[PDB]
Amino acid sequence: SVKFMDQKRSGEETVYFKKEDEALLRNLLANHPEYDPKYS
Amino acid sequence: PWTTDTTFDDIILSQPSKEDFAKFTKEAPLFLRFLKLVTDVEGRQEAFIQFA
């Protein structure tokens, strides 16, 4: 029950925030081109 | 060259206006690099970000 809950929680959070990080990596360079090395 | 939407004429004979002028899309990056440099020197990055 303990390792069960912990590992389920960790996997769910990992998947969710993996998706969110993918989306943010998609939409970063547009809204923050000052970091984009394309213009440097 | 043939175009289905544009026509070539003399500027003084046409007396064209801004909307009579034809529009196209130009590639930015070569200009945007130089612009980033110039704005980093001059100290106005808001303008670079807005324009980009």
Distance CA A25, CA A16 (A): 14
CA distances for B51 relative to A32, B1, B3, B24, angstroms: 13, 32, 30, 17
Please name the residue of chain B whose CA is at the shortest distance from the CA of residue A36.
B33
Burial A1-34 (b: 16+ CB within 10 A, else e): eeeeeeeeeeeeeeeeeeeeeeeeeeeeeeeebe
Residues of chain B contacting A40 with CB distance shorter than 8 Å:
33, 36
Tokens read off for B8: 């070539």
The data reach a resolution, in angstroms, of 2.9
Decide if A40 touches B, using CB distance below 8 A. yes
**Exposure on the CB side of residue B28, measured as CA atoms within 13 A:** 10
Question: Which residue in the block uniquely carries the two structure tokens 């989306």?
Answer: A23
